[PDB]
Design a protein around this nucleic acid. Sequence first.
RNA 1: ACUGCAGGGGAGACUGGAAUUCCUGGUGUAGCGGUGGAAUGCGCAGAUAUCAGGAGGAACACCGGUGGCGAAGGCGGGUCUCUGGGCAGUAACUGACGCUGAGGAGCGAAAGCGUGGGGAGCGAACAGGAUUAGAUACCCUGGUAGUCCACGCCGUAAACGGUGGGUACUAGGUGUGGGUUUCCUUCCUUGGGAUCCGUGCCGUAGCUAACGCAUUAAGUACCCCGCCUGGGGAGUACGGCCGCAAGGCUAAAACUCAAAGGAAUUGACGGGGGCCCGCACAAGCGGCGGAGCAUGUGGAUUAAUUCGAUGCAACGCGAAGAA
Lengths: 155, 117
Amino acid sequence: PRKGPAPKRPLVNDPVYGSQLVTQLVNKVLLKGKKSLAERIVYGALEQARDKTGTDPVITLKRALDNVKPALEVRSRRVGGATYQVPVEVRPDRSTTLALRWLVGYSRQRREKTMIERLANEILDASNGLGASVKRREDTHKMAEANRAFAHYRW
Amino acid sequence: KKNVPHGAAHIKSTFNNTIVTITDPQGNVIAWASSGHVGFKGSRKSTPFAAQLAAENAARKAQDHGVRKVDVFVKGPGSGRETAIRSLQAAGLEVGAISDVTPQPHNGVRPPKRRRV
RNA sequence: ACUGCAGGGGAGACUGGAAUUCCUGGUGUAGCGGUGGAAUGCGCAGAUAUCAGGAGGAACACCGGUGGCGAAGGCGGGUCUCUGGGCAGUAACUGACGCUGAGGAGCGAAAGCGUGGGGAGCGAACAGGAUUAGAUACCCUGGUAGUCCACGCCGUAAACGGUGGGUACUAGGUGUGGGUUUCCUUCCUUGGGAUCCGUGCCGUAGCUAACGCAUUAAGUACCCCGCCUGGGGAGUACGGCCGCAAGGCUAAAACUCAAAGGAAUUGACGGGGGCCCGCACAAGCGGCGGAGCAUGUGGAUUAAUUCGAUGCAACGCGAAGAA
Ligand SMILES: [Mg+2]
Ligand SMILES: [Mg+2]
Ligand SMILES: [Mg+2]
Ligand SMILES: [Mg+2]
Ligand SMILES: [Mg+2]
Ligand SMILES: [Mg+2]
Ligand SMILES: [Mg+2]
Ligand SMILES: [Mg+2]
Ligand SMILES: [Mg+2]
Ligand SMILES: [Mg+2]
Ligand SMILES: [Mg+2]
Ligand SMILES: [Mg+2]
Ligand SMILES: [Mg+2]
Ligand SMILES: [Mg+2]
Ligand SMILES: [Mg+2]
Ligand SMILES: [Mg+2]
Ligand SMILES: [Mg+2]
Ligand SMILES: [Mg+2]
Ligand SMILES: [Mg+2]
Ligand SMILES: [Mg+2]
Ligand SMILES: [Mg+2]
Ligand SMILES: [Mg+2]
Ligand SMILES: [Mg+2]
Ligand SMILES: [Mg+2]
Ligand SMILES: [Mg+2]
Ligand SMILES: [Mg+2]
Ligand SMILES: [Mg+2]
Ligand SMILES: [Mg+2]
Ligand SMILES: [Mg+2]
Ligand SMILES: [Mg+2]
Ligand SMILES: [Mg+2]
Ligand SMILES: [Mg+2]
Ligand SMILES: [Mg+2]
């Protein structure tokens, strides 16, 4: 706001999988306070993910995120009589946030039956670099690589 | 097929555009690739990014004719005046001397009327 | 009058360099130009760019300032010729010859006008493009008169210090331009003191409605000229004089209004400025606006649809109970 930064909230380690990345994924799936429902999707989709690779799924999850982290985003600004996008650097804890919104966000409009198998396909199609969440990485970058001329207006 | 080892790079940088031509010391033009040759159109040509690609395109096209060392003669009140010189160093050239040949009239001809924007 | 001194004061003739544009060649290839963003335009028939030569016009970077000069308008690239004024000192000379000045006469930025030259750039009118409800404008590409020179006319400007000219007097403090002169004088310091004429800044007495002026008066006084008498009508009509014309100078009345004004004060306001805050925006999450239905309102209808609420701050409000 006006008065500087606000203290960000801590995340406890997930009890089944010893990593903070899984408990940050269950909060993007979470709707309407149904957290035990959102934990039966993320625990369910990771167990479905190890039955098609055999690799441990939190190692599969981090390679799914390293292919959808943006390095440059395209924040907008009005200058004169024409407004145009400005490429800025993405800080690391936003790159985790903006990627997990894209796995959950493009899995809700994917063509399968249950959310457990829609999410488990998008993680596996991003660990290989083929999904639709991966395509938004090289659409955010292409809009940020077509606007290097405007990098001198950094607010 | 022209071959010359020592050259002279001229840079003109206005409020609308930049042009980087590269000549021999006798004054004959070798390569001239500017900010419209590198793909831009409109107000984007005046940006400092469009000057560090115009200077790269004239540098590699001059090194094919054997240019290894240039002299820099900038002129014009532009913002792509410093980024074009640093762009020539990261293309395999040596800058040597940097001069300033901006034309300064001795109160000669009359300037146009001032803009009431 | 004599001796010194400072200066963009004026006039004429000759003349110097940078830059803009064009022309003629050399190299070179697809863009250049332009704006808040574009487009008209230029170019691919060799443009912009880069180098060399040539033609022409206009203005004079640095010195240049808070500064000089002139009655004001105004005045600066250099040189020669001709020429006006000012200041200080000497106190040689004339012996009130002084000041102002109705009418009058001369000078008088810029625009404009006449005849003839010149025309690089800039640029009214003009045209096209964009902006917009429209855009006869702002912004952009072009571009004619004119701006320049010679000889005449015009005679107006916020021609201003919005302050007529001469003189005498009335605390000072502190810069800067032109002189002359005394003290440590050769301690050189080109510092200090005295005096004369410019030019600014701040300040006391005094004046002023206030702001402010204040030894360069808007103070205290005397001599002469111009001018004012509520605001519009109006610096207009008619008459006259000047002018080639555009127009200038002198200058009214009927009628109409009860005001038009000058400085300062408090506030509100700004597409003025500084700093600061709010779910204001940004970063997020979930909605409304579409559908059926419930409830309130506008409208319409009705014998009656009781009345009240009507930007935020009325519309699941008075109504926490209308068969
Ligand atoms: Mg002179
Ligand atoms: Mg010349
Ligand atoms: Mg020409
Ligand atoms: Mg040529
Ligand atoms: Mg040329
Ligand atoms: Mg002269
Ligand atoms: Mg006698
Ligand atoms: Mg007189
Ligand atoms: Mg004239
Ligand atoms: Mg005419
Ligand atoms: Mg004429
Ligand atoms: Mg003529
Ligand atoms: Mg037009
Ligand atoms: Mg114009
Ligand atoms: Mg003459
Ligand atoms: Mg006359
Ligand atoms: Mg008058
Ligand atoms: Mg004047
Ligand atoms: Mg007057
Ligand atoms: Mg007087
Ligand atoms: Mg006199
Ligand atoms: Mg004095
Ligand atoms: Mg004062
Ligand atoms: Mg008075
Ligand atoms: Mg009257
Ligand atoms: Mg008249
Ligand atoms: Mg008449
Ligand atoms: Mg007032
Ligand atoms: Mg304000
Ligand atoms: Mg928002
Ligand atoms: Mg609805
Ligand atoms: Mg009612
Ligand atoms: Mg309510």
